[PDB]
């Protein structure tokens, strides 16, 4: 009937071995009209009794206390964790099979939902994935590796871009809008990560972690039901004799069972005191409201009585096992009868059974590399910087010109990385700011000479245009690479987990757009190298030609910190350029220095350089070659300040189209930029 | 092949200073990242600073930030490390290395010894 705050609480609290925090759970029961619990499941194979009967016990308690309970069928998560031979279609059969077992397990089907992760994520792709990247952005790679146990894996060592999966599970907490995470203790590390993320985004209400007991494995050298033995677990439609065989050979020491120390990772450690027969009694028999067990006429009302009787040898090992076999066979009976008397359900079960000889000890399937594009197509990522140096920008421009010249049939796309640059924490880590700076840098690059034929795309167009296929590409690429391999890209200097996803996204983008070549600056050649690596030398790496406009200080006398005035940027206005060229280093009778270097570059670009000299200083002259120019600077013939005014003149000229945009179209964005520059006080 | 030769090392007192230089050949220095790395006695190689082609992007190991300065002359194919306010912890063989990209280097010169001690 009707229940109150205190009896609702006692009931919900009894679900979990641990509850972070008890005060929050109480405040939830008092305040919230409908409480949403959730648990998620990798569809990897026949269902273990823990995910069926034991789960059903705890869900019934949750629904009794006035909760909705969501089953998150984690199809993409099983793909990322290399289940069912990594075949997504087979994983979805297993998922359908799981939903049939849960429907026969006697749960309140008015307050239980069965959601598919892929279906739900793709329906809200913009919301979900932004948060996944935001979680990765704000966390270290070390912190995410520590979540390895939620996948039954070991940190470092083997992780294979199984960094994304924990980031996703965490996103989910918020996505489902769950109030209570009601998963097993081995998930505790990612649940804590979700509570950590509330503090990062300033959300005051945190999800309550109501973690449940991890049910023990049947065989002797293991404290959890595993992938090594089919005999470590009872499956949910095991025949009555298979149930008997498994329980009969089970480890069964005559020792009283005490509660385990809650380890920080949550995964149970193997111990000889842990008796899995008694653990089944405690979790699947005595956890149901009115449950009781009986051996030879005696009826034991609580678990303590049955345990006490077994320790003092009033009940024998074979008697206790025969009691459990009966208790389990009664509980699995409804499930067997459903699969015995339904064509659809029976077919699913047969398909799942066929994957025990159909998907394992056969090399796991992985996404195939697409073939090469027929027409050559180059790709170049815009730097997400407030301050793009002129030398870098010039090299981008020249690389696109050089490509078009070499392949007149072909294409060049500049990608604006408005998703992946947020993920890697490029500026302030804020979407608004990163879009602004990319739009600004795009405009100024065109103003400095980027060909009109160059196509411009955002990640946003690419991703939202292919909501499913893009992220499946990313999952495919991620599965095929060790985390250590992506760590090597940054020489072990990865500052956040978002940088790992950024690398995967770039490759996915290069594949989506059918690119034959990737063009790299000095700032991203480490990332684009991965695209070549992944495609097995199919995609070619073109390097930009930098080093032609140097820093303006004296070589061999650099300041410890480079100031703004020591380097030419492409957002420099008239005042900036005058100021930098004024302070720039040059000296008489010297063949080389930064000013001569900038002049030699301008001479190459414009054909010649005209020094305007009032007579008495030598009058006017043109230099049409660099060798003539350095000779006159070395002889003393050309005074430093004469050259300086000539260089200054040409830099203002080349920058005229750009400086017009700085005062007009881009003035809205540039104001929003220089606030984000100051916001980098740190 | 790639050749790199360092110079400028020696013995100084704490608070002293030096300027290392590296002369290079056999590759396109002017379009390459370049590194300074060091090896203290019974320790691994560790990078000290690095600089991109245009001299506009520079990084420094935390312990030398504000005291050391890296620069390059692309015309002369030489790299420079100005070391000021030297400390005993800076004692090491300093090497000049070619950068493949911002986070990696391969070829190294023979190295130049730097010692910072008051003892002698
Ligand atoms: N022996 C056991 N006893 C009790 N509970 C057990 C158990 N073995 C597994 N479980 C729990 O049963 C659930 C399903 O386990 S699982 O199939 O390995 N799937 C997972 O562990 C999750 N990684 C899947 C997931 C969950 C939530 C998400 O937002 C996303 C993905 C988890 O809550 C797990 O803790």
Short mmCIF file of N, CA and C and ligand atoms in Angstrom, two decimals, chain A residues 38-42 50-51 72 74 77 150 165 169 172 183-184 186-187 212-215 225, ligand 1:
data_model
loop_
_atom_site.label_atom_id
_atom_site.label_comp_id
_atom_site.label_asym_id
_atom_site.label_seq_id
_atom_site.Cartn_x
_atom_site.Cartn_y
_atom_site.Cartn_z
N UNK A 38 18.94 3.88 -12.43
CA UNK A 38 19.41 3.24 -13.67
C UNK A 38 20.55 2.25 -13.46
N UNK A 39 20.61 1.26 -14.35
CA UNK A 39 21.73 0.34 -14.45
C UNK A 39 21.92 0.08 -15.94
N UNK A 40 23.16 -0.18 -16.34
CA UNK A 40 23.51 -0.39 -17.73
C UNK A 40 24.13 -1.74 -17.90
N UNK A 41 24.10 -2.26 -19.13
CA UNK A 41 24.49 -3.64 -19.39
C UNK A 41 25.14 -3.78 -20.74
N UNK A 42 26.32 -4.39 -20.78
CA UNK A 42 26.96 -4.71 -22.04
C UNK A 42 26.33 -6.00 -22.55
N UNK A 50 23.30 -12.96 -11.90
CA UNK A 50 23.43 -11.66 -11.23
C UNK A 50 22.72 -10.52 -11.97
N UNK A 51 22.80 -10.51 -13.30
CA UNK A 51 22.11 -9.49 -14.10
C UNK A 51 20.62 -9.74 -14.25
N UNK A 72 19.73 0.51 -19.33
CA UNK A 72 20.46 1.10 -20.46
C UNK A 72 21.14 -0.05 -21.17
N UNK A 74 23.54 -1.28 -23.45
CA UNK A 74 24.75 -0.56 -23.80
C UNK A 74 25.43 -1.17 -25.04
N UNK A 77 28.74 0.33 -26.09
CA UNK A 77 29.71 0.08 -25.04
C UNK A 77 30.30 -1.32 -25.15
N UNK A 150 35.86 -0.61 -14.53
CA UNK A 150 34.45 -0.67 -14.94
C UNK A 150 34.25 -1.51 -16.19
N UNK A 165 34.99 5.02 -23.66
CA UNK A 165 33.92 4.36 -22.99
C UNK A 165 33.66 4.88 -21.60
N UNK A 169 30.15 6.69 -20.27
CA UNK A 169 29.33 6.20 -19.18
C UNK A 169 29.04 7.30 -18.22
N UNK A 172 26.38 9.77 -19.84
CA UNK A 172 25.17 9.10 -19.46
C UNK A 172 24.70 9.50 -18.08
N UNK A 183 24.23 0.65 -9.89
CA UNK A 183 25.06 -0.36 -10.55
C UNK A 183 25.88 -1.09 -9.52
N UNK A 184 26.65 -2.08 -9.95
CA UNK A 184 27.52 -2.85 -9.05
C UNK A 184 28.74 -2.08 -8.58
N UNK A 186 31.90 -2.60 -8.84
CA UNK A 186 32.99 -2.44 -9.80
C UNK A 186 32.80 -1.26 -10.77
N UNK A 187 31.65 -0.58 -10.72
CA UNK A 187 31.40 0.62 -11.50
C UNK A 187 31.67 1.89 -10.72
N UNK A 212 25.48 -1.85 -5.62
CA UNK A 212 25.09 -3.16 -5.09
C UNK A 212 26.23 -4.17 -5.01
N UNK A 213 26.01 -5.20 -4.20
CA UNK A 213 27.00 -6.22 -3.92
C UNK A 213 27.39 -6.98 -5.18
N UNK A 214 28.67 -7.32 -5.30
CA UNK A 214 29.15 -8.10 -6.43
C UNK A 214 29.06 -9.57 -6.10
N UNK A 215 28.23 -10.28 -6.85
CA UNK A 215 27.96 -11.68 -6.59
C UNK A 215 29.16 -12.55 -6.98
N UNK A 225 32.04 -13.65 -10.99
CA UNK A 225 31.62 -14.52 -12.11
C UNK A 225 32.13 -14.00 -13.47
N1 LIG C 1 28.96 -10.51 -10.31
C1 LIG C 1 28.16 -9.46 -10.36
N2 LIG C 1 27.36 -9.22 -9.31
C2 LIG C 1 26.58 -8.14 -9.34
N3 LIG C 1 26.45 -7.22 -10.29
C3 LIG C 1 27.25 -7.49 -11.31
C4 LIG C 1 28.11 -8.56 -11.43
N4 LIG C 1 28.80 -8.50 -12.64
C5 LIG C 1 28.34 -7.41 -13.20
N5 LIG C 1 27.41 -6.75 -12.45
C6 LIG C 1 26.81 -5.46 -12.75
O1 LIG C 1 25.87 -5.64 -13.78
C7 LIG C 1 25.94 -4.53 -14.68
C8 LIG C 1 26.26 -5.00 -16.08
O2 LIG C 1 27.65 -5.38 -16.15
S1 LIG C 1 28.32 -5.32 -17.60
O3 LIG C 1 27.51 -6.12 -18.42
O4 LIG C 1 29.68 -5.60 -17.40
N6 LIG C 1 28.21 -3.82 -18.11
C9 LIG C 1 28.90 -2.83 -17.49
O5 LIG C 1 29.71 -3.11 -16.63
C10 LIG C 1 28.71 -1.37 -17.79
N7 LIG C 1 30.10 -1.04 -18.13
C11 LIG C 1 27.78 -0.99 -18.94
C12 LIG C 1 27.30 0.43 -18.88
C13 LIG C 1 26.56 0.89 -17.82
C14 LIG C 1 26.10 2.19 -17.76
C15 LIG C 1 26.39 3.06 -18.78
O6 LIG C 1 26.03 4.37 -18.69
C16 LIG C 1 27.12 2.62 -19.86
C17 LIG C 1 27.57 1.31 -19.91
C18 LIG C 1 26.91 -3.55 -14.05
O7 LIG C 1 26.18 -2.80 -13.11
C19 LIG C 1 27.81 -4.47 -13.27
O8 LIG C 1 28.33 -3.81 -12.13
#
